[PDB]
Amino acid sequence: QYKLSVVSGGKPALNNLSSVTGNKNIARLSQDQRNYIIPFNNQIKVYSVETRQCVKTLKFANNSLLSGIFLQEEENNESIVKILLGDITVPQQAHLITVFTNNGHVIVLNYKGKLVESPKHFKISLADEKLANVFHSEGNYRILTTFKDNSLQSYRLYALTFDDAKKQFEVAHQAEWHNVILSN
Amino acid sequence: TLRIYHIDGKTNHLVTSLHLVGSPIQTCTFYTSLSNQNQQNIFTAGRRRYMHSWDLSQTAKIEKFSRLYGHESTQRSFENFKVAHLQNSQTNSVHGIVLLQGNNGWINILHSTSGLWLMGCKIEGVITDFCIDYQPISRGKFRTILIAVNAYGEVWEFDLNKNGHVIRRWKDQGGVGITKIQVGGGTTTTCPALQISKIKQNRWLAVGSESGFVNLYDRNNAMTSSTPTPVAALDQLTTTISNLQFSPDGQILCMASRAVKDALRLVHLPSCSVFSNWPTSGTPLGKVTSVAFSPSGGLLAVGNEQGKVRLWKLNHY
Amino acid sequence: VLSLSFSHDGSYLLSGGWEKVMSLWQLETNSQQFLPRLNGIIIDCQVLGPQGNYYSLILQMTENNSNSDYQFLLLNASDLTSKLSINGPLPVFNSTIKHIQQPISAMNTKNSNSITSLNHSKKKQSRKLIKSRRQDFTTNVEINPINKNLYFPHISAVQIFDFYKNEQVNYQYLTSGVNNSMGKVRFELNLQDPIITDLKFTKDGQWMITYEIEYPPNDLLSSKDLTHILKFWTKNDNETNWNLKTKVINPHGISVPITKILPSPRSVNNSQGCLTADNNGGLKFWSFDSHESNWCLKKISLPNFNHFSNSVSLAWSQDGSLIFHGFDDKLQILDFDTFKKFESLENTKTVSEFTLDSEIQTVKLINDTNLIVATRTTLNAINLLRGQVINSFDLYPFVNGVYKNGHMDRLITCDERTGNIALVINQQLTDVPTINYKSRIIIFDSDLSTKLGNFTHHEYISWIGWNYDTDFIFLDIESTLGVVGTNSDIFAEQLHKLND
Amino acid sequence: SPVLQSAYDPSGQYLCYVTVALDKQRVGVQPTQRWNENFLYLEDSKLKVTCLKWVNDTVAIILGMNNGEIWLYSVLANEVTYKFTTGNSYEIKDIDLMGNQLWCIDSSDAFYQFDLLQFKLLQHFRINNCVQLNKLTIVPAGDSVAQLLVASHSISLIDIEEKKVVMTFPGHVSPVSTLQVITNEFFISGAEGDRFLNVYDIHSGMTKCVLVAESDIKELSHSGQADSIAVTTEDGSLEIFVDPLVSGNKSKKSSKKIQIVSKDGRKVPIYNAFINKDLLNVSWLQNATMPYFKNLQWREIPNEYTVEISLNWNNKNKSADRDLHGKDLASATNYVEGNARVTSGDNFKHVTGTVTVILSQALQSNDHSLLETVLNNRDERVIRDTIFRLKPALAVILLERLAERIARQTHRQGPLNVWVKWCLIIHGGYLVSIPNLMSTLSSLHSTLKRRSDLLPRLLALDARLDCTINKFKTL
Amino acid sequence: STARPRIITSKAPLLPQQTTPEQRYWRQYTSAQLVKEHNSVTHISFNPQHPHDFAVTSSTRVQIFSSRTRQVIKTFSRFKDVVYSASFRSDGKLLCAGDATGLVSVYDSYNPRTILLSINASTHPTHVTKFHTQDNKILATASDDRVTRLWDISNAYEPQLELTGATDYVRTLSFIPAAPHLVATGSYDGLIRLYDTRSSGSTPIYSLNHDQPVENVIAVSPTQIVSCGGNNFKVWDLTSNKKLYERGNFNKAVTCLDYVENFDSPMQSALIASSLDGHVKVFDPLDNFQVKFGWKFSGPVLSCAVSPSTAQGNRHLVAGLSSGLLAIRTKKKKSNNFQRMMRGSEYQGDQEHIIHNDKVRSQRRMRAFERNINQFKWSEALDNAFVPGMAKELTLTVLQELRKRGKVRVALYGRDESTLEPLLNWCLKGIEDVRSASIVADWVAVVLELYGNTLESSPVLQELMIDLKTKVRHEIHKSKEAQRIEGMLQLLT
RNA sequence: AUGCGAAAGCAGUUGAAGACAAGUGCUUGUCGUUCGUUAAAAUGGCCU
User: Is any Cβ of chain A less than 8 angstroms from the Cβ of C4?
Assistant: First the structure.
């Protein structure tokens, strides 16, 4: 009879929880520079630039894995913090995306198409401290994280690769800095 | 208007007839990128204070460069502008630049596919003209040299890898009123390369004067002797020069006036000899305004004031 | 300096100040060229291009106080044109939401904070949100009855946004403000901007009505009074910019807020009439003269009462005859044609004046069969066939002080065909009230005997309005608009595949 | 037309077309049934594509080049797979193929037989009494490659193991241009420039039918079992006959006629259609060199039909970052008033020596000058007598005119206030008598509201002024 | 990005009787020209076809004036006694003239030498002579013999048709648009009569009771007539045979009347009445006959006319006064080698595929004060606002917008007495008003807050402050008296 | 400056620890530090 639904997304989902990083921008331009990916509050949007138009709206809700992760109705502590272009698993693959959240979940999805309900999901361990940043050279990736034992945060830098076995993520201690004030 | 024609021998069918508004097109030029090699642009400009860029099929993409970030006080116009590649020497990211004439000795240089102001150099007197040459160094590394002619005949040669540092000056022999320069024999603004390896040093250098005289130099020894003598001195025409264009391969020099009918000549290099049979008294030119060569087909294209361009295939190439 | 950025090689400096201007500094000759106005202040900017085709930048919209609403912008750097503009829908709330921090600056105002005040205000807001039992988040949201757009009233601004495509389609200012003339810095920041507070449509949609108040500067002789301005706009059926057609200075004497505004039914003048009621008891009916070009007073009724209700409302019969003028606690029913009390020859205890318990928040009529009234403690459903109450519902558990007087109007809405929609909202406590919220929706029939449908939503709901095509739309605090309602082949694939 | 030659592949999904560019010919392939860049240039500058044909696992084509060569061109990799070489240097007049046996006809009047599988020249060859040869084909008798056809202006049918004419038919005036087998006993022929397609029956040797075109004939295609014949006619038209082998019936006119015209009304030509049963595939040239397609259903087509397209003729360039005019979308319409009427909130509308005769005269009429003089009188006693003399409706009209003159010229409110004081002294009876005080005295009510509620700001300013005044002129 | 917003001038709400658009146009009629003639002017008309001509009758002297020069071009004086009525023909080539000796004289214009035809009607004075409108060869004369005659201009010897039954002194007549057979006559005792010609014609079809003596009548539309009689004037409906309006909006008897339709102006159809008291008033029949504009001439106006609807020249409004006065008011209205060398700019781009414009919409100027404001130099902004020959509205909108945006103190700190003074003078005036007086009260308040030390130091301002003490006390007495007269009107309710 | 209230106003609020900097263990001042409650400054202004 009467049914309730969530239709239109809202806020464009800043990196406010950090508030110490000097580059809050999360959205990213694709390899082929015809399209642009925006991490919203309840969805992830695909825009085609030369028509200024939305094309695919990867909603968090319809996907069970995301809905079992991203709309946890006790706290939305887990939020998206980094987007990477290709496939972290194997290099030289097309229309793929890796999403990196606040708590140790790493997802691979694939826009430009009927997104199959088989998200390539992995968990990066040692989640007693929460993820701060992720970036990359060719192949050798680095992870910034936020630790504490005076009302500041310690930053740990870790090195990262893939596939010891499929799930075992090669996070290793690189360095640590004691209490950051401002960073970029 | 910009009109783009596809060329047969037997027909010439109109690809596109783009028409702008309020912009008298004084100079237009193709430009293909180098690294991506799938990016194509058309630049046009006149005596306004902007510059139109058309990208490369029902509704086209056109931007207008307008802001010289530091100084509009020099160049109140865009009447003379060419395009050239430039290598960065830190990153190997060769990119396209547009060079603009200016006020007194100001040549300004704008990074093209950004719209940025990269660098400006200046000589004194009154800049009449300028052109581009290259020099390869190593496997895919090469420096671009800008050549500029004052009215009096003080040729400057600058380079552009490091910022504007005068390589050298010299003075053309004679040369009262200089009114066009062009290099040739290799790559240029009309015969550009398509990938970085084929960039070849230009050999011949042409200075077209106000009389009709054309001084013609060899670079390989001109650069040495540093106030050098001409390889030769053409003295055919009786009026001003306004178009000097080299072959793709470096043999043929087309010179062209702008003031009387049928005022074009062809000069065969290295003899610096005027051709004799062509053109005759039976070839329709009118006031020649615009010459253009082909890359590899062997075509010469000539426009004029009446509006009718004409083609001439060299059966040799 | 709120954003710094470098060009790719190391020759240009993108500067991101408060003043709404993004500045490029060419370092070499040390000169600057800059983009002057960008709809707010710039938190972030950087260069994304493989050579530098694109600047990315992130805007704050600092004019909105209660909720920091950010916007993504992508600029082609050749023209400096807005190649891409992305923004979610923009509300404005009565009070600030859970733990947002206005950015840093040099001074303090009601739009910004100095550093010490920043930390102290973060703690102060969290503590007050736990402590104070007053808070509400009640905004006004409109629906275009021929375009199905949503008209969010920003301060001094209007956002036209449709939720079929989930993309903003227009942004405008509607106020004699300082909106783009100058980016504010310090005392210009302590200055406050003229606020749209009421916005409604005519049912034909070809006459938009708005009402904005404007404030004075500080510390002058005339800083004692405020100024209220009424405005009537049109537009065509295809344009997307509104043309102002009549602006009215100071309705209802001087310094009197217009408190409730009403769009007339179709039946009177093809929906070209409006009702304005002040806070003392007056009525005015304005409309559109067509042999003039304009809007005028059609009828007045101004008592001079020296008591003031902050909370009024009024509703109108569908046959254009019965005007339910609800002041605080004592309703009246008037005949429209004389604006005086319904004087009966029958006198059968359906008398024109009604008394209820406490201050009346919102009256509607669902048909000409039932008048639905909401006061500060309960909700009552009364007949019009007979001067007698029908249904009563106790609410003083919930609506205690949790709504500033006059905002259950923007809570309760109804269809004109089936029923009415009631709202309850509770903060999810632990044992102390926590920050988090929760919401309950009721769907009532015209008789209000049975709840036609109950629903729960896990977050705070700010506003439910009714869609003319028989459904309901609602705005959530996290701005998520929700609804309540009913050889050859292989070769073919390969052809699509395609230093010495 | 700038397409030098073109040919569909059988089962109609691709066309190969050869054109010129800077006087070097290039060949390219494009699909039709739903742009492409892999073109092939011929590196020599004197050669021309002289004939073109398809073959089907690598789908490939065969190009006869007037240098004297026949190239087999792979279409997947743009590479010249093989180079069949005549033992001569002339033009290949024509090519044809079946199974893997292939026969080509040479401009010095020569026959050649090759095989594809062996890449090999089987037999160089000649016959007699055939002085020019510019079309040939082979009948599809089965795998048996017997009795092929050659023609220049008189079609001739020849054996292989007997290598002689057996039936010779009187062809056309022009050299023939189009020569195809429909059924194993019937072939169609149409020369260069004539408008008649002759349907020749082999075994009787009889000119069984003629089809007339409307104009000169350029390209010919036909259905499976003579179910339909499509003709691309040089002025740019597609004409189809239904059932040529059915039966005043020695000639057959065109059954249906199709042209292409865009929105502009200029007539885009048509080249080289292709037909199957119930499916017609028409092509044309959109830009100067690129071909576009359409499919359509000929049995649903009426007799004369004009396929439309949306061709760019005077498109305003309504780009992505632009407004309806001027602005970019991320801006805002900035607020500008323009021409709105501004009213206040209290403008109630739409709800003994006397002079009384001259005032009442001007006010019955509407006389600025006389009203000006009768108010330019100044004596209070004169005022008293005259307003005691006046008639009430004229007192009402006096009140409105008076308030008007004040509200424009504020200086006069000093002297003129005695009248509006004195008007209400006397005619209070009739003023009480009229109902609509507010709408009868609209302007006066407004102006008094103005000054009266302005007052307190003036009070505050007077106070602070006097404070300063005393403070400095006491010392 | 965006563009800058232009500042708006503070449009304060309107006080009654705004400048109506009709008043704009009908005062664009300007430039009073006076020419003194011999004696009173009876009748004035304009040529129909090329409307560049208009004729005026007088005491025995007909004058033709022309529209280009507004001057006398031609003179008709071949008459014996007083000519009454001259008109042009509907085709324009010919004109008729009616005298008091008992005859009309008709001849083509521009040539007084050739009396083309001379018809002797009744020996009574022929009062008015006109032509048909639809027909072109039938002329009508009303003579004072209470009978009007239709002379067919071929056989001028006898009246082609009489028209009798009138009471006394037929002084006007008009034809009718839809019909060429239906003729209206205005007597001098009322009874505006309506006759047929395709009947026998001795008796009228019917009449109308203008109970005053009718002074003019005009076919305004092929279903409506207007009548000028006595003080008022009226408009009658033909089919219902029943008047639709009366407008009694005059002082003496209305004398002359004219109607005009569909020209280029913000009003559709104009009706001019000229009413013997200087007063010429234009109404419009589409606004249900209300007054729209009116001028005053000293003497009584006897005739008035407008330039016709196909004017195409500078339009005329002609008024004729009994003192001898024609008063007019008139709304007025390289090298060949070079061009071949650069002839390209004038092309517009017709037969090209894709067209794009992008140049700016070239705005109005920016005033120097606006440049001052947008470049923030606020003291210079105020001084440039008090440049002497400026608009008062400009000065107000300057101070209003500065007071909204920035700070009057930061625009007032760098001050001395010698630049304090002009602002103070403008306050000294602008406090007298209202709409200025509020804002300028704020400003005088803040400057008196600031500069008291310089006040007691300097004597020039002490002069200005004592006068300002008077003016506010003078102004407060005015607004204090305002409330008494407002509350007094409450007592009348 | 919070609560209540109409645009009037009507009541109340401004308190702790820490750590550091300067002047001479003492005074002031500061807080990218915590508790507790209804709580102005580096001549530096808007594109074509």
Answer: yes
